Design a protein around this ligand. Structure first.
Ligand code: NA
Ligand SMILES: [Ru+3]
Length: 129
């Protein structure tokens, strides 16, 4: 599923991501924009053989099981395919674990490089929330 900007904002809010660990909703929308272009089915293979999955490009090295990332963990206790669903629940639940793990949203390199320090409220501006 490819979300609209305000549509994703609303779904993230419903699932408790707004201000989660102090990160306002626009941070999460900005991160999803640059990680996946709002596409739940996005996947990208990393140089190390791990893969990033879903709207927030969660990595199989640590967070989900895809069966083809040796030595990896599955800290969200989910198949990586669950992160590709039209329903964002699994991605949100796992993102909550990630952002709680010490480095906040810096875990998402696109957030650090393209969202951090910017006017992230612009991502939810105009949306009925
Ligand atoms: Na894994
Ligand atoms: Ru804009």
């Amino acid at each position: 599923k490819v979300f609209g900007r305000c549509e994703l904002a609303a779904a993230m809010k419903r699932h408790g991501l707004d201000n989660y660990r102090g990160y306002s909703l626009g941070n999460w929308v900005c991160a999803a924009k640059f990680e996946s272009n709002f596409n739940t089915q996005a996947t990208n293979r990393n140089t190390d053989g791990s893969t990033d999955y879903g709207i927030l490009q969660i990595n199989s090295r640590w967070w989900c099981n895809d069966g083809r990332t040796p030595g990896s963990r599955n800290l969200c206790n989910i198949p990586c395919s669950a992160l590709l669903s039209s329903d964002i629940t699994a991605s949100v639940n796992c993102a909550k674990k990630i952002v709680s793990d010490g480095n906040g949203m810096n875990a998402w390199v696109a957030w650090r490089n393209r969202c951090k320090g910017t006017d992230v409220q612009a991502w939810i501006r105009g949306c009925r929330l």
